[PDB]
Amino acid sequence: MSLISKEELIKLAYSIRPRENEYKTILTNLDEYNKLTTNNNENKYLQLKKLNESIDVFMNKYKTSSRNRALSNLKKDILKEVILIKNSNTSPVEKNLHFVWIGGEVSDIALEYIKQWADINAEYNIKLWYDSEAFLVNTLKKAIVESSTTEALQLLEEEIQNPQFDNMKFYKKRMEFIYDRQKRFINYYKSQINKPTVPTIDDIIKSHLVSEYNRDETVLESYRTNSLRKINSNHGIDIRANSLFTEQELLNIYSQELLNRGNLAAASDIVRLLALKNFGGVYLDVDMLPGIHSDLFKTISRPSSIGLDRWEMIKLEAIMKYKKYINNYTSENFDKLDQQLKDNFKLIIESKSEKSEIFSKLENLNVSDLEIKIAFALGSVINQALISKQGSYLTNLVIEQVKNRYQFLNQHLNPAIESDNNFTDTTKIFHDSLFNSATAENSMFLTKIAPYLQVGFMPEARSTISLSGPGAYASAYYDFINLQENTIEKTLKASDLIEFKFPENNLSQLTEQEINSLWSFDQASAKYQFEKYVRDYTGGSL
Numbered sequence: 001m002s003l004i005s006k007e008e009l010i011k012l013a014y015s016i017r018p019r020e021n022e023y024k025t026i027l028t029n030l031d032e033y034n035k036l037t038t039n040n041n042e043n044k045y046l047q048l049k050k051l052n053e054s055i056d057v058f059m060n061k062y063k064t065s066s067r068n069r070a071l072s073n074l075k076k077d078i079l080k081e082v083i084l085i086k087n088s089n090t091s092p093v094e095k096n097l098h099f100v101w102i103g104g105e106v107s108d109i110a111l112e113y114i115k116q117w118a119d120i121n122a123e124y125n126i127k128l129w130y131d132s133e134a135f136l137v138n139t140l141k142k143a144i145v146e147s148s149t150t151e152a153l154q155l156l157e158e159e160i161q162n163p164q165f166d167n168m169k170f171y172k173k174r175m176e177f178i179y180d181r182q183k184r185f186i187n188y189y190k191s192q193i194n195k196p197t198v199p200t201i202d203d204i205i206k207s208h209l210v211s212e213y214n215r216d217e218t219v220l221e222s223y224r225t226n227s228l229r230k231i232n233s234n235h236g237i238d239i240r241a242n243s244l245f246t247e248q249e250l251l252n253i254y255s256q257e258l259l260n261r262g263n264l265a266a267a268s269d270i271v272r273l274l275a276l277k278n279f280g281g282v283y284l285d286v287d288m289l290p291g292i293h294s295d296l297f298k299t300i301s302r303p304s305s306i307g308l309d310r311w312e313m314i315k316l317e318a319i320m321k322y323k324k325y326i327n328n329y330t331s332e333n334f335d336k337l338d339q340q341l342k343d344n345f346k347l348i349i350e351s352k353s354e355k356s357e358i359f360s361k362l363e364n365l366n367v368s369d370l371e372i373k374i375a376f377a378l379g380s381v382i383n384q385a386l387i388s389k390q391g392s393y394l395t396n397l398v399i400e401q402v403k404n405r406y407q408f409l410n411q412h413l414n415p416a417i418e419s420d421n422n423f424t425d426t427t428k429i430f431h432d433s434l435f436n437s438a439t440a441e442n443s444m445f446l447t448k449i450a451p452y453l454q455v456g457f458m459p460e461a462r463s464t465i466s467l468s469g470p471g472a473y474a475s476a477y478y479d480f481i482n483l484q485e486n487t488i489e490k491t492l493k494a495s496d497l498i499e500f501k502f503p504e505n506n507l508s509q510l511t512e513q514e515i516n517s518l519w520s521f522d523q524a525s526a527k528y529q530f531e532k533y534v535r536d537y538t539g540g541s542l
């Protein structure tokens, strides 16, 4: 299904005025798009983009020309053509399953989740990416946070007891102690990393922990070697041995999250894009599970008292109550069911004997070389599940989004950091520079990355979404769909992206492990944590 012909547009866009130079260029660009000999998707997309740009040139210079009605209609057809190109030359994505666990020992629970994908898709090659030099990053982060927690409680000992105490005062003061301790580590790291002994990240962390956190070198080394052994025995593949990092800029971004911030989710955000770029296939967070067979429970009616998400959780709890594929999976929600419902679940679940009659196989996941598919959550894309052919056009758009976003971040953040001010004063310098570059186009992005330094340590610090996370994907989707580049303002949402959705029957997101985030926490979690901190420090309560 092609575009209108040049001759058709001449009739539709007819004017009594002579043909402007900009219009003759549209007509040539349209004609050449229509006469393309190639079947290369990227070639067709780029010619389509050239055409679209040439239409915008005309329409912005002659905002009154009568031609704009037919040109506007052509623009709408061009958008549809993008989808037609995308849904062409499709073939099965490379049969790789990519997982990422960086910063410490991969947990048994994570391996149980991975096992479900392995059991069901034996033909897929499983790659569990890790960083061979960085098994002590999580240990360091926990040591920093726990020491800072104590310093903050001591400092606020008289005030934390108040029933009127805003626990945010604890989190702000603890963040000051966290930031100083991170600086202490980073400066030590900088003093070691260029030595001719060429120490590793873990060499440096271990020395820092031994001398500054009263840790035992041999215990840390045992944890390090056991983490390496465990992951290598469970599909482990080292990012540092597979040329994922093909340029210094991407290594620097990965490193600033791994080392300076201790944000392993952000580090994982970078690795998964490079793995899909270089190998193609499916990326999944370790808390994702296979999709349930489309009709396994169609016969069971969800009661009106249970929401849609809670019902999806219940289906999984039911499967696990009766098949125990995953050791001790929660039944918190399934156990509250009316008995007739529990018995209906048991009947269906136990009627099936093969795991692949409960869960869906991936089989062939047909995609084109232009696209990436993504899961949705709460109205937005969420990059916890991805599908992409190697070298795909859209995956490269996301990578450029990420690089541009960190370029802007670091331009304003690096001067603030290099001032060696405390957390509060560093934040001010960062913010003052950041917001002096504000425009209508970038103001939302700026506000979302302003609390960057707090991510992982204070409630609702979510800058990662707009740097390496969903926000970079959503803007890349806007670029692809609208034939733009370097979009920072507009992000496409779930309702815009049905053409790019990770197929719903191939993914169960509402898992027990997904409920909780490992790089962030919300206000209710902050209260729960503060109460526990107060307990453990004073020996009291409340």
Ligand SMILES: O=c1ccn([C@@H]2O[C@H](COP(=O)(O)OP(=O)(O)O[C@H]3O[C@H](CO)[C@@H](O)[C@H](O)[C@H]3F)[C@@H](O)[C@H]2O)c(=O)[nH]1
Binding pocket: 099, 100, 101, 102, 103, 104, 138, 264, 265, 266, 268, 269, 284, 285, 286, 287, 382, 383, 384, 385, 464, 465, 468, 469, 470, 514, 516, 517, 518, 519, 520
């Ligand atoms: O100690 C650690 C802790 C976490 N990770 C990596 O971070 C990934 C996501 O962590 P997690 O599921 O706990 O946080 P979540 O809030 O759901 O992440 C979203 O936001 C994240 C940030 O954009 C995004 O990565 C994710 O896809 C979203 F769902 C996890 O699957 C690992 O690959 C790690 O390697 N080592």
Ligand SMILES: [Mn+2]
Binding pocket: 285, 287, 384, 513, 514, 516, 517
């Ligand atoms: Mn998760």
